[PDB]
Amino acid sequence: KEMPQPKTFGELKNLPLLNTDKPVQALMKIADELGEIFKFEAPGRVTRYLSSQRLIKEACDESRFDKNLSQALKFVRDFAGDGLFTSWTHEKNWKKAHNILLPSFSQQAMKGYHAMMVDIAVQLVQKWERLNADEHIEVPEDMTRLTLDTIGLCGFNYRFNSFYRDQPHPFITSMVRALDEAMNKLNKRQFQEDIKVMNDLVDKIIADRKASGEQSDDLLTHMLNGKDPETGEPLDDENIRYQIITFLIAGHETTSGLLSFALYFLVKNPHVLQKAAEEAARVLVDPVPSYKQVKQLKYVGMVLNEALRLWPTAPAFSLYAKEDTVLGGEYPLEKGDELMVLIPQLHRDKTIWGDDVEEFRPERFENPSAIPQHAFKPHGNGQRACIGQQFALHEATLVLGMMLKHFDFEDHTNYELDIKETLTLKPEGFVVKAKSKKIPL
Amino acid sequence: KEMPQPKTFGELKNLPLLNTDKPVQALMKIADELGEIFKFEAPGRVTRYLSSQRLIKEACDESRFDKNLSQALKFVRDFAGDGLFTSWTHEKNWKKAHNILLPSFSQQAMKGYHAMMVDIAVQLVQKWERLNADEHIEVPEDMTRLTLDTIGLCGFNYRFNSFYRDQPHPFITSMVRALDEAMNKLNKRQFQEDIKVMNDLVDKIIADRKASGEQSDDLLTHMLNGKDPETGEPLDDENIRYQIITFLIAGHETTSGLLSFALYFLVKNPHVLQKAAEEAARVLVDPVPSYKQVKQLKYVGMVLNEALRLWPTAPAFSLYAKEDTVLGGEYPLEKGDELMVLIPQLHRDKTIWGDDVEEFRPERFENPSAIPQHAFKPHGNGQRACIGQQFALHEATLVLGMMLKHFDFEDHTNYELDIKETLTLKPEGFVVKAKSKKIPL
Ligand code: HEM
Numbered sequence: 001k002e003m004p005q006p007k008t009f010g011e012l013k014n015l016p017l018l019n020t021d022k023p024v025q026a027l028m029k030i031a032d033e034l035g036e037i038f039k040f041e042a043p044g045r046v047t048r049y050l051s052s053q054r055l056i057k058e059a060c061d062e063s064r065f066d067k068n069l070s071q072a073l074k075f076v077r078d079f080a081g082d083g084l085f086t087s088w089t090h091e092k093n094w095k096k097a098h099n100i101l102l103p104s105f106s107q108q109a110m111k112g113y114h115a116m117m118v119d120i121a122v123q124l125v126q127k128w129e130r131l132n133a134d135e136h137i138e139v140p141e142d143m144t145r146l147t148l149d150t151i152g153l154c155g156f157n158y159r160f161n162s163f164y165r166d167q168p169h170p171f172i173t174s175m176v177r178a179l180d181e182a183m184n185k186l187n188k189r190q191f192q193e194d195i196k197v198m199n200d201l202v203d204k205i206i207a208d209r210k211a212s213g214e215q216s217d218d219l220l221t222h223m224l225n226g227k228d229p230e231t232g233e234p235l236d237d238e239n240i241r242y243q244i245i246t247f248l249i250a251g252h253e254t255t256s257g258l259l260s261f262a263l264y265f266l267v268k269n270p271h272v273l274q275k276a277a278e279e280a281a282r283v284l285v286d287p288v289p290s291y292k293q294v295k296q297l298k299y300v301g302m303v304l305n306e307a308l309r310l311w312p313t314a315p316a317f318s319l320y321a322k323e324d325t326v327l328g329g330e331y332p333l334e335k336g337d338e339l340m341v342l343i344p345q346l347h348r349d350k351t352i353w354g355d356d357v358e359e360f361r362p363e364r365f366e367n368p369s370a371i372p373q374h375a376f377k378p379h380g381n382g383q384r385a386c387i388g389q390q391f392a393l394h395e396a397t398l399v400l401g402m403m404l405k406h407f408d409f410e411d412h413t414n415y416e417l418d419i420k421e422t423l424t425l426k427p428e429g430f431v432v433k434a435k436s437k438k439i440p441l
Numbered sequence: 442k443e444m445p446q447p448k449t450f451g452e453l454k455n456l457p458l459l460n461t462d463k464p465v466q467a468l469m470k471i472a473d474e475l476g477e478i479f480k481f482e483a484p485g486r487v488t489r490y491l492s493s494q495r496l497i498k499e500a501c502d503e504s505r506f507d508k509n510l511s512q513a514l515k516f517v518r519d520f521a522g523d524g525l526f527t528s529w530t531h532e533k534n535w536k537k538a539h540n541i542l543l544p545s546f547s548q549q550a551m552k553g554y555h556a557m558m559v560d561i562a563v564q565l566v567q568k569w570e571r572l573n574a575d576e577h578i579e580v581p582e583d584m585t586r587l588t589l590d591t592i593g594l595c596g597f598n599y600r601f602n603s604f605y606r607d608q609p610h611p612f613i614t615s616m617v618r619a620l621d622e623a624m625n626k627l628n629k630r631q632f633q634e635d636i637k638v639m640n641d642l643v644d645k646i647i648a649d650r651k652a653s654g655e656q657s658d659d660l661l662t663h664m665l666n667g668k669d670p671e672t673g674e675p676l677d678d679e680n681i682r683y684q685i686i687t688f689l690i691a692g693h694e695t696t697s698g699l700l701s702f703a704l705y706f707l708v709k710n711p712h713v714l715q716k717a718a719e720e721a722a723r724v725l726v727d728p729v730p731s732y733k734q735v736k737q738l739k740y741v742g743m744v745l746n747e748a749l750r751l752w753p754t755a756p757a758f759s760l761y762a763k764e765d766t767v768l769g770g771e772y773p774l775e776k777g778d779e780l781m782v783l784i785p786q787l788h789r790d791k792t793i794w795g796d797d798v799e800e801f802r803p804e805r806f807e808n809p810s811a812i813p814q815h816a817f818k819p820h821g822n823g824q825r826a827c828i829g830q831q832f833a834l835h836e837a838t839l840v841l842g843m844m845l846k847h848f849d850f851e852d853h854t855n856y857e858l859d860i861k862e863t864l865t866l867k868p869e870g871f872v873v874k875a876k877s878k879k880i881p882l
């Protein structure tokens with residue numbers, strides 16, 4: 001009944017505990033010591049961190065809890081506006097965009113984004129094919145180039161051309177700077193400058209597109225043509241711009257982090273790498289992978305789910321209680337009380353996953369139906385779950401598959417995992433050498 | 442632009458492609474091949490089958506399209522007359538009966554039928570309790586005994602006493618024989634004899650009722666006393682008779698089919714059966730269920746909706762274009778042109794439901810507000826939607842809940858699904874053994 005709580009520092013409460021570069025990892029160690037639920041206080045605030053599937057399945061009951069805008073999400077709203085990621089469920093533009101955009105993010109819709117995803121994946125592979133013997137790969141850096149350019153192309157048919165330069169396109173520079181500043185907030189002149197850089201570019205392409213009348217395979221075309229079935233209204237130009245900025249912010253680092261952690265785990269587990277490589281060789285028989293072929297990369301998909309189990313790259317999400325309620329028969333909550341889902345801890349619940357939780361074993365995803373409800377949530381929950389989940393996984397499966405078809409990989413530095421935390425997680429400094437198998441691309 | 446259409450064979454048109462007694466199942470396979478819409482021609486006619494949520498949302502626009510009386514409904518009209526189910530929207534009696542009967546079919550109205558529902562549900566449970574050790578249950582047969590008796594009792598306080606008989610009451614024998622003849626038309630003396638059997642008994646019960654002034658908790662009372670708010674008129678005795686026949690023909694096998702498919706899906710999915718049985722045990726704490734308790738059977742309602750998603754028991758309905766119009770911006774239709782809604786195919790639209798559409802998963806319905814509009818239509822559309830929908834769902838939730846409370850079920854023949862098509866769908870020959878939990882009534 002009494003909720004555990006970590007060390008307090010007078011009026012600062014628990015605040016000094018996340019005055020660290022790695023607060024989620026600090027929170028996992030607190031969860032290790034205190035168990036499935038603890039109270040966390042800051043001067044004006046209170047939360048409860050949840051770690052067990054027991055309590056989190058209740059937190060995911062949408063009749064009882066809804067997505068909360070955490071402080072991080074409120075700072076990101078300064079440039080992400082009322083796009084899907086930073087809106088209350090009850091805001092009109094949340095429901096409008098959700099309704100219009102949902103079918104355009106379905107597994108079926110991936111068929112239409114496939115060609116441009118392939119476009120950028122081929123640019124990454126070709127870069128690595130062109131490296132000289134004396135060179136290596138900076139993995140998260142190249143995966144972020146890849147995901148930024150893919151979401152740019154698929155999002156609004158715009159080419160950042162990240163593989164053509166040392167210094168990113170100025171939008172990306174501003175976007176990264178802006179995101180950086182909002183997290184550090186947990187400067188102002190630069191912040192305002194970088195917001196303008198982003199709106200100016202995105203507003204222009206929207207204007208350009210409406211002028212030309214061109215119809216493309218991108219999300220922008222869907223959004224200009226879409227009408228909310230409920231209200232019958234379309235999105236206005238301003239919200240369309242926030243949705244575009246939102247896809248980039250929410251999708252670029254989560255997805256490149258996934259690809260990075262997956263290649264990390266594969267080079268640290270050569271038997272798993274070989275099984276994955278053998279599937280990729282058998283399935284991707286063409287110089288350019290097809291939509292259907294990506295779907296047949298089942299073990300690669302398990303690899304990615306298992307990397308998501310151990311290091312879900314957007315590792316915590318916030319909820320509020322809709323009404324007074326009791327959590328797991330022991331913890332009374334008041335309307336509006338906040339809950340944080342600590343997803344990496346959820347994914348380490350030995351009562352669900354067995355005792356070998358720290359082991360990288362993709363085979364645990366061999367039978368999806370065998371995973372109990374709400375045990376695996378790297379994409380959040382219910383109607384506020386990641387709308388980009390099919391996009392992220394199709395992208396990552398495509399690219400990792402191509403990586404394994406075309407190269408052998410070496411952990412030439414015997415890399416020691418160092419997890420950098422921002423809004424997302426990634427293995428900082430992860431580097432590898434790739435030797436080409438000289439297969440037609 | 443041009444509408445897809447399967448191969449034609451000279452003067453036979455597409456007829457050779459439907460050489461089956463299971464045309465909806467065959468049409469679903471043609472839809473898997475040709476997509477969200479196709480034209481289907483036979484020597485006598487032309488129809489267009491719609492399968493996607495996006496085009497069905499348009500066909501559901503009542504200012505553009507209205508309910509069409511298909512040939513089936515026109516043959517049924519020979520004994521169902523101008524009751525709600527077989528009349529055109531523009532008929533005077535349609536609008537009067539609609540206005541008068543609606544409040545008698547509301548969720549609130551179910552409070553008043555609840556006791557009579559429980560009466561027949563207890564008889565079913567007792568039948569099964571009283572079976573000897575080596576006996577088994579004929580599932581559609583017993584559910585149809587149940588729904589016919591429940592609609593008879595709730596509809597005009599008449600007892601068919603189906604659980605006392607091998608051969609049904611003569612009314613039921615003539616009704617189901619008339620129904621069978623109407624569908625086979627797609628004999629004449631028997632058909633006329635069955636019509637007079639049906640008219641005589643119902644006309645006689647109506648006469649007996651007004652000759653006694655007796656007030657009951659049934660629909661006949663409601664129709665004898667109600668007056669259309671719009672015209673101030675009441676229904677006449679002949680129409681009241683057609684509405685009673687109509688409730689029975691429209692509700693008996695749709696509802697019994699639902700109960701049979703749900704039980705099918707539970708015994709083929711033991712873990713789902715267990716979760717539902719656990720809810721039934723937790724909620725049904727009294728010897729007999731209350732109205733309030735049936736309403737709290739959330740997961741049992743989810744099971745029934747998921748059964749309805751996969752095999753909606755009245756699987757297709759027909760519409761006509763009210764005026765010239767263009768469907769989905771690509772397919773021009775003329776006034777009077779017919780559209781068929783292929784509900785099982787609609788319910789397998791992967792842009793809506795995900796790629797996993799053949800899996801039985803009740804949790805799809807955990808948050809009903811989060812299912813897209815017009816995605817789920819087992820009860821038809823708008824003012825011509827199933828008026829019995831609350832009745833059917835209260836009935837099925839109550840009975841399934843009691844089944845799961847009082848018995849364990851064994852699929853002792855490893856039953857192979859065989860879906861018989863008539864006006865409705867049912868798992869023909871579905872057979873089960875129950876082991877009583879010995880919980881007294
Ligand atoms: C492996 C990659 C990804 C992971 C781990 C991830 C994870 C998440 C999580 C945990 C949430 C819920 C946030 C909350 O509850 O506050 C979320 C929401 C969201 N993500 Fe993803 N995401 C990924 C990829 C993407 C991609 C590629 C896109 C865009 C193309 C994207 C767009 C969004 C959007 C728009 C939302 C909000 C949806 C709504 O509430 O309506 N994400 N994501």
Ligand code: HEM
Binds near residue numbers: 688
């Ligand atoms: C799960 C069971 C049920 C299913 C799936 C079902 C489904 C349907 C559907 C699809 C329609 C529309 C037909 C069309 O457009 O041509 C319909 C209409 C109708 N149903 Fe139901 N039905 C069910 C139960 C009931 C019950 C229990 C009753 C009667 C007590 C009933 C009475 C009616 C009536 C009279 C109509 C005509 C309504 C009007 O047009 O005004 N149905 N049903």
